[PDB]
Short mmCIF file of N, CA, C and O in Angstrom, two decimals:
data_model
loop_
_atom_site.label_atom_id
_atom_site.label_comp_id
_atom_site.label_asym_id
_atom_site.label_seq_id
_atom_site.Cartn_x
_atom_site.Cartn_y
_atom_site.Cartn_z
N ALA A 183 0.48 -1.28 0.08
CA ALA A 183 0.17 0.09 -0.44
C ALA A 183 0.84 1.30 0.00
O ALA A 183 0.95 2.37 0.98
N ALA A 184 1.47 1.75 -0.85
CA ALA A 184 2.27 2.01 -1.42
C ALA A 184 1.22 4.00 -1.61
O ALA A 184 2.24 4.81 -2.22
N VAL A 185 0.39 3.31 -2.44
CA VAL A 185 -0.36 4.54 -2.47
C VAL A 185 -2.12 4.50 -1.84
O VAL A 185 -2.75 2.70 -1.55
N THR A 186 -2.49 5.50 -1.92
CA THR A 186 -3.63 5.06 -0.48
C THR A 186 -4.34 5.92 -0.84
O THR A 186 -4.10 7.73 -1.15
N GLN A 187 -5.59 5.84 -0.94
CA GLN A 187 -7.43 6.55 -0.95
C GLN A 187 -7.46 6.82 0.05
O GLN A 187 -8.30 5.94 1.01
N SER A 188 -8.29 8.29 0.43
CA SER A 188 -9.16 8.49 1.35
C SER A 188 -10.30 9.66 0.47
O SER A 188 -9.80 10.11 0.03
N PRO A 189 -11.45 9.07 0.89
CA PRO A 189 -11.51 8.53 2.18
C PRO A 189 -11.92 6.90 1.01
O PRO A 189 -12.31 7.30 -0.05
N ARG A 190 -12.05 5.57 1.69
CA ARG A 190 -12.45 4.32 1.13
C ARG A 190 -13.51 4.34 0.93
O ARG A 190 -13.71 3.19 -0.19
N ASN A 191 -14.31 4.93 1.63
CA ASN A 191 -15.90 5.18 1.21
C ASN A 191 -16.52 6.70 1.04
O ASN A 191 -16.25 7.21 2.11
N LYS A 192 -17.52 6.61 0.96
CA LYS A 192 -18.24 7.87 1.08
C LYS A 192 -19.63 7.88 0.25
O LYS A 192 -20.09 6.67 -1.15
N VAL A 193 -20.45 8.38 1.53
CA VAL A 193 -22.56 8.74 0.46
C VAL A 193 -22.42 9.77 0.38
O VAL A 193 -22.22 11.16 1.66
N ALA A 194 -22.54 10.43 -0.58
CA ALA A 194 -23.07 12.19 -1.15
C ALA A 194 -24.17 12.55 -1.05
O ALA A 194 -24.81 11.48 -1.43
N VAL A 195 -24.73 13.61 -0.92
CA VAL A 195 -26.14 13.78 -1.41
C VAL A 195 -26.52 14.65 -2.27
O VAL A 195 -24.93 15.50 -2.90
N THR A 196 -26.71 14.74 -3.35
CA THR A 196 -26.69 15.44 -4.55
C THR A 196 -26.97 17.00 -4.66
O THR A 196 -27.18 16.76 -3.75
N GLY A 197 -25.60 16.81 -5.19
CA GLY A 197 -25.54 18.76 -5.21
C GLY A 197 -24.75 19.15 -4.05
O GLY A 197 -23.83 19.56 -4.40
N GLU A 198 -23.25 17.64 -3.34
CA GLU A 198 -22.44 18.29 -2.17
C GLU A 198 -21.45 17.99 -3.20
O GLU A 198 -21.33 17.19 -3.93
N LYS A 199 -19.60 19.49 -2.48
CA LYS A 199 -18.71 18.75 -3.51
C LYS A 199 -17.85 17.33 -2.39
O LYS A 199 -18.17 17.22 -1.78
N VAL A 200 -17.47 16.77 -4.12
CA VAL A 200 -16.64 15.92 -2.69
C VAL A 200 -15.20 15.63 -3.04
O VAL A 200 -15.23 15.55 -4.96
N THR A 201 -14.41 15.80 -2.30
CA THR A 201 -13.26 15.57 -3.00
C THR A 201 -12.58 14.41 -1.91
O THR A 201 -12.65 13.74 -1.39
N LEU A 202 -12.07 13.91 -3.55
CA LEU A 202 -10.87 12.20 -2.45
C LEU A 202 -9.49 12.23 -3.44
O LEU A 202 -8.90 13.06 -4.31
N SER A 203 -8.97 11.82 -2.17
CA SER A 203 -7.44 12.27 -2.51
C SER A 203 -6.91 10.94 -2.71
O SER A 203 -7.47 10.10 -1.65
N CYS A 204 -5.76 11.04 -3.17
CA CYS A 204 -4.87 9.54 -3.10
C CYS A 204 -3.80 10.24 -3.08
O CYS A 204 -2.77 11.31 -3.35
N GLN A 205 -3.19 9.90 -2.52
CA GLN A 205 -1.40 10.27 -1.41
C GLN A 205 -0.84 8.91 -1.44
O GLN A 205 -0.93 7.88 -1.92
N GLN A 206 0.59 8.88 -2.39
CA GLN A 206 1.52 7.49 -3.08
C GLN A 206 2.93 7.75 -2.00
O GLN A 206 3.33 9.24 -1.69
N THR A 207 3.18 7.10 -1.62
CA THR A 207 4.93 6.59 -1.26
C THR A 207 5.67 6.69 -1.66
O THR A 207 6.65 5.86 -1.62
N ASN A 208 5.32 6.25 -3.61
CA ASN A 208 5.79 5.60 -5.06
C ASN A 208 7.43 6.52 -5.04
O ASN A 208 8.27 6.01 -5.97
N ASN A 209 7.02 7.62 -4.87
CA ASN A 209 7.65 9.40 -5.30
C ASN A 209 7.29 9.21 -7.10
O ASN A 209 8.17 9.60 -7.55
N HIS A 210 6.20 9.32 -7.55
CA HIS A 210 5.92 8.85 -9.23
C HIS A 210 5.50 10.15 -9.52
O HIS A 210 5.76 10.94 -9.01
N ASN A 211 6.19 9.97 -10.53
CA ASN A 211 6.05 11.92 -11.13
C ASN A 211 4.65 11.46 -11.88
O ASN A 211 3.87 12.95 -11.24
N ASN A 212 3.87 10.16 -12.33
CA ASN A 212 2.45 10.80 -12.67
C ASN A 212 1.67 10.22 -11.51
O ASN A 212 1.79 8.87 -10.74
N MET A 213 0.31 10.98 -11.32
CA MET A 213 -0.75 10.87 -10.68
C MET A 213 -1.65 10.28 -11.55
O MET A 213 -2.53 11.15 -12.51
N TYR A 214 -2.63 9.47 -10.58
CA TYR A 214 -3.88 9.06 -12.42
C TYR A 214 -5.33 8.73 -11.94
O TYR A 214 -5.62 8.51 -10.61
N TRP A 215 -6.31 9.40 -11.88
CA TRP A 215 -8.05 8.88 -11.10
C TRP A 215 -8.84 8.35 -12.07
O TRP A 215 -9.23 8.87 -13.48
N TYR A 216 -9.55 7.30 -12.07
CA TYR A 216 -10.18 6.17 -12.87
C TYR A 216 -11.42 5.68 -11.90
O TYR A 216 -12.05 6.08 -10.77
N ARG A 217 -12.49 5.75 -12.87
CA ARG A 217 -13.90 5.37 -11.99
C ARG A 217 -14.03 4.13 -12.70
O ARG A 217 -13.69 3.68 -14.52
N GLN A 218 -14.60 3.04 -12.08
CA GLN A 218 -14.66 1.76 -12.54
C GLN A 218 -15.89 1.21 -11.90
O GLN A 218 -16.10 0.77 -10.78
N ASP A 219 -17.23 1.32 -12.90
CA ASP A 219 -18.41 0.88 -12.89
C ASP A 219 -18.83 -0.91 -13.45
O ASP A 219 -17.29 -0.92 -13.54
N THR A 220 -19.88 -0.60 -12.67
CA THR A 220 -19.55 -2.36 -12.14
C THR A 220 -19.93 -2.87 -13.83
O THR A 220 -20.98 -2.78 -14.71
N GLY A 221 -18.56 -3.93 -13.63
CA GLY A 221 -18.92 -4.63 -15.33
C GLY A 221 -18.84 -4.32 -16.15
O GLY A 221 -18.36 -4.48 -17.50
N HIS A 222 -17.54 -3.22 -15.89
CA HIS A 222 -16.48 -2.25 -16.69
C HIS A 222 -15.28 -1.79 -15.93
O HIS A 222 -14.50 -2.75 -15.33
N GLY A 223 -13.86 -2.08 -17.32
CA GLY A 223 -12.81 -1.55 -17.06
C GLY A 223 -12.69 -0.64 -16.14
O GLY A 223 -13.36 0.68 -16.17
N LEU A 224 -11.67 0.08 -15.87
CA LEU A 224 -11.19 1.21 -15.53
C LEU A 224 -11.24 2.26 -15.88
O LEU A 224 -10.03 2.04 -17.39
N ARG A 225 -12.72 3.66 -15.99
CA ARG A 225 -12.02 4.42 -17.24
C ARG A 225 -11.65 5.75 -16.39
O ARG A 225 -11.82 6.25 -15.43
N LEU A 226 -10.05 5.98 -17.44
CA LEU A 226 -9.36 7.10 -17.35
C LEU A 226 -10.19 8.72 -16.97
O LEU A 226 -10.59 9.47 -18.22
N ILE A 227 -10.56 9.19 -15.78
CA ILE A 227 -11.10 10.54 -15.79
C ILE A 227 -9.88 12.07 -16.07
O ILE A 227 -10.54 12.60 -16.86
N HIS A 228 -9.23 11.78 -15.22
CA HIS A 228 -8.09 13.03 -15.01
C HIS A 228 -6.62 12.05 -14.69
O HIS A 228 -6.52 11.16 -13.54
N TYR A 229 -5.20 13.00 -15.22
CA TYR A 229 -4.23 12.03 -14.52
C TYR A 229 -3.54 13.59 -14.35
O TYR A 229 -3.77 14.67 -14.67
N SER A 230 -1.91 12.77 -13.93
CA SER A 230 -1.15 14.25 -14.07
C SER A 230 0.44 13.85 -13.90
O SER A 230 0.38 13.08 -13.55
N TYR A 231 0.82 15.17 -15.08
CA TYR A 231 2.42 14.87 -15.40
C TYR A 231 3.50 14.91 -14.33
O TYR A 231 4.99 14.70 -13.93
N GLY A 232 2.78 16.29 -12.94
CA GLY A 232 3.57 16.07 -11.44
C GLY A 232 2.83 18.03 -11.39
O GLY A 232 2.21 17.68 -11.77
N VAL A 233 3.95 17.94 -10.28
CA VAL A 233 2.52 19.01 -9.44
C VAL A 233 1.99 20.43 -10.42
O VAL A 233 3.18 20.73 -11.23
N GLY A 234 1.64 20.47 -9.99
CA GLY A 234 0.83 21.04 -10.95
C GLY A 234 -0.17 21.56 -12.01
O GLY A 234 -0.93 22.09 -12.71
N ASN A 235 0.20 20.44 -12.63
CA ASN A 235 -0.54 19.32 -14.22
C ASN A 235 -1.43 18.94 -13.44
O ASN A 235 -1.09 17.83 -12.66
N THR A 236 -2.52 19.03 -14.64
CA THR A 236 -3.63 18.08 -14.40
C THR A 236 -3.47 17.94 -15.83
O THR A 236 -4.03 19.18 -16.72
N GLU A 237 -4.37 16.64 -16.02
CA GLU A 237 -5.21 16.73 -17.38
C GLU A 237 -6.09 15.84 -18.25
O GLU A 237 -5.92 15.00 -16.81
N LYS A 238 -7.05 16.34 -19.20
CA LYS A 238 -7.93 15.78 -18.54
C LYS A 238 -7.92 14.16 -19.61
O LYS A 238 -6.65 14.29 -20.53
N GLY A 239 -8.86 13.20 -18.37
CA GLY A 239 -9.02 12.27 -19.44
C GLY A 239 -9.13 11.80 -20.49
O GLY A 239 -9.88 12.78 -21.25
N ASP A 240 -10.55 10.83 -20.57
CA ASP A 240 -10.99 10.66 -21.76
C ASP A 240 -12.93 10.31 -20.59
O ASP A 240 -13.17 10.77 -22.38
N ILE A 241 -12.98 10.36 -20.33
CA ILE A 241 -13.90 11.15 -19.49
C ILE A 241 -13.93 12.09 -17.90
O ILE A 241 -14.36 11.74 -16.48
N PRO A 242 -13.02 13.25 -19.13
CA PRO A 242 -13.42 14.00 -17.56
C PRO A 242 -14.22 15.44 -16.88
O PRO A 242 -14.44 15.46 -16.38
N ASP A 243 -15.60 14.75 -18.05
CA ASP A 243 -16.93 15.43 -17.42
C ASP A 243 -17.55 15.61 -16.27
O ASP A 243 -17.38 14.73 -16.12
N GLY A 244 -17.85 16.92 -15.36
CA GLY A 244 -18.79 16.63 -13.89
C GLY A 244 -17.45 16.42 -12.89
O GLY A 244 -17.82 16.82 -11.64
N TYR A 245 -16.06 15.92 -13.07
CA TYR A 245 -14.76 16.02 -12.67
C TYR A 245 -13.81 17.49 -12.82
O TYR A 245 -13.39 17.64 -13.85
N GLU A 246 -13.38 17.59 -11.92
CA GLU A 246 -11.78 18.34 -11.74
C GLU A 246 -10.72 17.90 -11.35
O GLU A 246 -11.33 16.62 -9.90
N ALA A 247 -9.16 18.16 -11.04
CA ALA A 247 -8.43 17.45 -10.01
C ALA A 247 -7.28 18.47 -10.18
O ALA A 247 -7.38 19.71 -10.52
N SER A 248 -7.25 17.93 -9.41
CA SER A 248 -5.40 19.39 -8.53
C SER A 248 -4.23 18.29 -7.93
O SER A 248 -5.05 17.22 -7.40
N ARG A 249 -3.08 18.74 -8.69
CA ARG A 249 -1.83 17.49 -8.16
C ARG A 249 -1.24 19.17 -7.25
O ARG A 249 -0.49 19.48 -7.83
N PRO A 250 -1.68 19.25 -5.86
CA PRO A 250 -0.74 20.12 -4.43
C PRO A 250 0.40 20.20 -4.30
O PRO A 250 0.89 20.67 -4.15
N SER A 251 0.48 18.97 -4.67
CA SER A 251 1.81 18.23 -4.96
C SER A 251 2.42 16.99 -5.01
O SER A 251 2.16 16.84 -5.81
N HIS A 252 3.96 16.38 -5.29
CA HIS A 252 4.35 16.09 -6.24
C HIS A 252 3.36 14.43 -5.52
O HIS A 252 2.85 13.51 -5.88
N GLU A 253 3.24 14.10 -3.87
CA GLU A 253 2.28 13.23 -3.23
C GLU A 253 1.08 13.19 -3.20
O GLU A 253 0.92 11.53 -2.93
N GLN A 254 0.46 14.03 -3.57
CA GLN A 254 -0.95 13.63 -2.98
C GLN A 254 -1.67 14.54 -4.67
O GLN A 254 -1.37 15.61 -5.72
N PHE A 255 -2.65 13.48 -4.89
CA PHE A 255 -3.27 14.35 -7.31
C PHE A 255 -5.32 13.90 -6.15
O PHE A 255 -5.04 12.38 -5.87
N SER A 256 -5.50 14.66 -6.28
CA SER A 256 -7.29 14.59 -5.49
C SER A 256 -8.08 14.86 -6.57
O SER A 256 -8.28 15.82 -7.97
N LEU A 257 -9.27 13.92 -6.83
CA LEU A 257 -10.30 13.62 -7.35
C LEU A 257 -11.38 15.04 -7.01
O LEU A 257 -11.78 14.83 -6.14
N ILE A 258 -12.71 15.56 -7.25
CA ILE A 258 -13.27 17.00 -7.57
C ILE A 258 -14.13 16.27 -7.67
O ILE A 258 -14.74 16.29 -9.38
N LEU A 259 -15.50 16.43 -7.13
CA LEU A 259 -17.07 16.65 -8.08
C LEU A 259 -17.42 17.39 -7.23
O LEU A 259 -17.83 17.83 -6.01
N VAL A 260 -17.69 19.03 -8.07
CA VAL A 260 -17.64 19.85 -8.11
C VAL A 260 -19.45 20.05 -7.15
O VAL A 260 -19.54 20.92 -5.97
N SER A 261 -20.17 19.39 -8.42
CA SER A 261 -21.54 18.96 -7.44
C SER A 261 -22.12 18.00 -8.01
O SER A 261 -22.44 17.35 -8.86
N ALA A 262 -22.31 16.62 -6.95
CA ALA A 262 -22.63 15.29 -6.81
C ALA A 262 -23.52 14.78 -8.04
O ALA A 262 -24.48 15.25 -7.13
N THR A 263 -23.70 14.34 -8.75
CA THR A 263 -24.76 13.53 -9.01
C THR A 263 -24.79 12.26 -8.81
O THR A 263 -23.78 11.22 -9.49
N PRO A 264 -25.66 11.45 -8.73
CA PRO A 264 -26.20 9.93 -9.58
C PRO A 264 -25.72 9.55 -10.30
O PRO A 264 -24.79 8.11 -9.70
N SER A 265 -25.52 10.03 -11.46
CA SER A 265 -25.27 9.55 -12.06
C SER A 265 -23.22 9.59 -11.42
O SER A 265 -22.54 7.97 -12.42
N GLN A 266 -22.84 9.53 -10.96
CA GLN A 266 -21.25 9.90 -10.30
C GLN A 266 -20.62 8.30 -8.97
O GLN A 266 -20.28 7.97 -8.88
N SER A 267 -22.00 7.82 -9.10
CA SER A 267 -21.96 7.11 -7.84
C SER A 267 -21.41 6.22 -8.83
O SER A 267 -21.64 5.26 -10.46
N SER A 268 -19.84 4.95 -8.31
CA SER A 268 -19.58 4.35 -8.86
C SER A 268 -18.36 3.83 -7.94
O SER A 268 -17.81 3.52 -6.15
N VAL A 269 -16.80 3.08 -8.35
CA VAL A 269 -15.99 2.44 -7.15
C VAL A 269 -14.72 3.40 -8.00
O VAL A 269 -14.46 3.12 -9.50
N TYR A 270 -13.70 4.08 -7.31
CA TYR A 270 -12.54 4.95 -8.18
C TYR A 270 -11.78 3.99 -7.39
O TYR A 270 -12.07 4.17 -6.52
N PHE A 271 -11.02 4.76 -8.45
CA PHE A 271 -9.58 3.96 -8.51
C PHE A 271 -8.70 5.05 -8.63
O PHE A 271 -8.64 5.08 -9.59
N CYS A 272 -7.44 5.27 -7.53
CA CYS A 272 -6.56 6.27 -8.08
C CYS A 272 -4.70 5.14 -8.30
O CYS A 272 -5.52 4.15 -7.95
N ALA A 273 -3.91 5.65 -8.82
CA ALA A 273 -2.94 4.60 -9.35
C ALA A 273 -1.89 6.44 -9.61
O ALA A 273 -1.61 7.37 -10.07
N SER A 274 -0.27 5.45 -8.26
CA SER A 274 0.87 6.72 -9.73
C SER A 274 1.71 5.72 -10.09
O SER A 274 1.06 4.20 -10.59
N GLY A 275 2.52 6.20 -11.21
CA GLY A 275 3.35 5.59 -11.40
C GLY A 275 4.43 6.43 -12.86
O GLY A 275 4.46 7.60 -12.57
N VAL A 276 5.22 5.46 -13.73
CA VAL A 276 6.18 6.22 -14.77
C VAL A 276 6.06 5.90 -15.71
O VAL A 276 6.25 4.27 -16.04
N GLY A 277 6.48 6.20 -16.59
CA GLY A 277 6.53 5.31 -18.65
C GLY A 277 5.36 4.88 -18.24
O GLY A 277 4.02 5.08 -17.68
N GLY A 278 4.96 2.88 -17.87
CA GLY A 278 4.00 2.42 -18.23
C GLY A 278 3.58 1.44 -17.54
O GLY A 278 2.51 1.18 -17.34
N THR A 279 4.10 1.50 -15.99
CA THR A 279 4.01 0.97 -14.40
C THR A 279 3.49 2.37 -13.89
O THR A 279 2.64 3.69 -14.28
N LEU A 280 2.25 1.13 -13.03
CA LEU A 280 1.56 1.22 -12.34
C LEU A 280 1.15 1.02 -11.27
O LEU A 280 0.65 -0.66 -10.76
N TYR A 281 1.05 2.07 -10.02
CA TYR A 281 1.16 1.19 -8.83
C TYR A 281 -0.95 1.79 -8.27
O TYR A 281 -0.75 2.50 -8.31
N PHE A 282 -1.88 0.76 -8.45
CA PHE A 282 -3.39 1.13 -8.07
C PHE A 282 -3.37 1.22 -6.12
O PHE A 282 -2.79 0.53 -6.05
N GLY A 283 -4.41 2.35 -5.97
CA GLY A 283 -4.82 1.78 -4.21
C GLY A 283 -6.11 1.24 -4.85
O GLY A 283 -6.46 0.08 -5.89
N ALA A 284 -5.98 1.03 -3.06
CA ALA A 284 -7.95 0.55 -3.02
C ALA A 284 -8.54 0.37 -4.11
O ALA A 284 -10.00 -0.50 -3.17
N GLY A 285 -8.75 1.47 -3.67
CA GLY A 285 -10.56 1.49 -4.25
C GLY A 285 -11.37 2.60 -3.25
O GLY A 285 -11.49 3.00 -1.95
N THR A 286 -11.85 3.66 -3.86
CA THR A 286 -13.36 4.30 -3.10
C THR A 286 -14.33 4.09 -3.46
O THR A 286 -14.47 3.99 -4.42
N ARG A 287 -15.61 3.45 -2.91
CA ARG A 287 -17.00 3.18 -2.85
C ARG A 287 -17.85 4.24 -2.84
O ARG A 287 -17.37 4.67 -1.70
N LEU A 288 -18.27 5.26 -3.92
CA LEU A 288 -18.38 6.18 -3.73
C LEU A 288 -20.52 6.07 -3.76
O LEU A 288 -20.87 5.69 -5.14
N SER A 289 -21.93 6.75 -3.13
CA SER A 289 -22.82 6.56 -2.76
C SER A 289 -23.67 7.78 -3.13
O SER A 289 -23.29 8.75 -2.37
N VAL A 290 -23.56 8.41 -4.25
CA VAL A 290 -24.84 9.78 -4.07
C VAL A 290 -26.16 9.17 -3.80
O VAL A 290 -26.84 8.94 -4.99
N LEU A 291 -27.03 10.29 -2.97
CA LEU A 291 -28.66 9.83 -3.03
C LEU A 291 -29.02 11.18 -3.58
O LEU A 291 -28.67 12.61 -3.35
#
């Protein structure tokens, strides 16, 4: 567990801002946030090549991200919606290497 997600669970009410934090001890240059719906693969939401950089993934709409330090990468749902209920996984990495977090179950009510 060189990559830690917090919270591990989140129950949100529609409209609440939700911030998911990803913290690493890998010292990896890159960090990543994915969503995994039941029955599907990990879909890339946003990523980062280093502090202060965020890059839109394949499914960025209705998420922001922040890389405030080399070690931390946050995913922000500005205004939670039911369609955002899912399991979110972060990863650190460099080159093609990926080191995933344990996941965050998110239920939006």
